[PDB]
Amino acid sequence: EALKDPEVCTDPFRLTTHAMGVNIYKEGQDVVLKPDSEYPEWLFEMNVGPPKKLEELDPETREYWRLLRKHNIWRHNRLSKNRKF
RNA sequence: GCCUAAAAGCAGCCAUCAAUUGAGAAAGCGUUAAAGCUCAACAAAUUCACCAACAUAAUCCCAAAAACUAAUAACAAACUC
Ligand SMILES: [Mg+2]
Numbered sequence: 555e556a557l558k559d560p561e562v563c564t565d566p567f568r569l570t571t572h573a574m575g576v577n578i579y580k581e582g583q584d585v586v587l588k589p590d591s592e593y594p595e596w597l598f599e600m601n602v603g604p605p606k607k608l609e610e611l612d613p614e615t616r617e618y619w620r621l622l623r624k625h626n627i628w629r630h631n632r633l634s635k636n637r638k639f
Numbered sequence: 640g641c642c643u644a645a646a647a648g649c650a651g652c653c654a655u656c657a658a659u660u661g662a663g664a665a666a667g668c669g670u671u672a673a674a675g676c677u678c679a680a681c682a683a684a685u686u687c688a689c690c691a692a693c694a695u696a697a698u699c700c701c702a703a704a705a706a707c708u709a710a711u712a713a714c715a716a717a718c719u720c
């Protein structure tokens with residue numbers, strides 16, 4: 555009762571060559587890495603780092619108000635920490 | 640994600656990102672651990688809503704009573720006329 559024993563057989567090479575965890579069935583057939591001429595641009599056109607900020611988003615789009623609602627929930631949780639019930 | 644017999648939002652430590660118009664890797668109950676009951680977010684309305692209240696002694700309680708007819712009243716000394 556643990557995880558799969560197969561984990562990075564040749565870590566310096568195989569992991570760069572392709573991903574082995576995508577194959578789920580017992581029949582071992584690993585998929586090719588599909589070089590950069592296959593995936594579309596939206597894969598690289600997304601933030602792959604730290605998220606944005608409320609003092610950086612513009613108050614005319616929806617993600618700004620989404621982050622503001624998240625911060626409002628956080629503030630309510632911080633304030634309601636003294637629930638004596 | 641680690642630790643742990645188990646740590647599923649909730650012994651704990653670190654991150655706290657991600658779709659939906661909209662729901663915190665979760666602010667409180669609950670389970671050994673789950674489950675389950677709530678809170679905050681949308682859609683449904685919108686009275687006001689922050690703190691303030693706390694026992695008793697011994698012979699027998701201790702004037703009786705009275706919320707509205709006009710009050711800078713009146714009655715009241717060895718004071719003063
Ligand atoms: Mg959203």
Ligand SMILES: [Mg+2]
């Ligand atoms: Mg609610």
Ligand SMILES: [Mg+2]
Binds near residue numbers: 694
């Ligand atoms: Mg008593």
Ligand SMILES: [Mg+2]
């Ligand atoms: Mg007199």
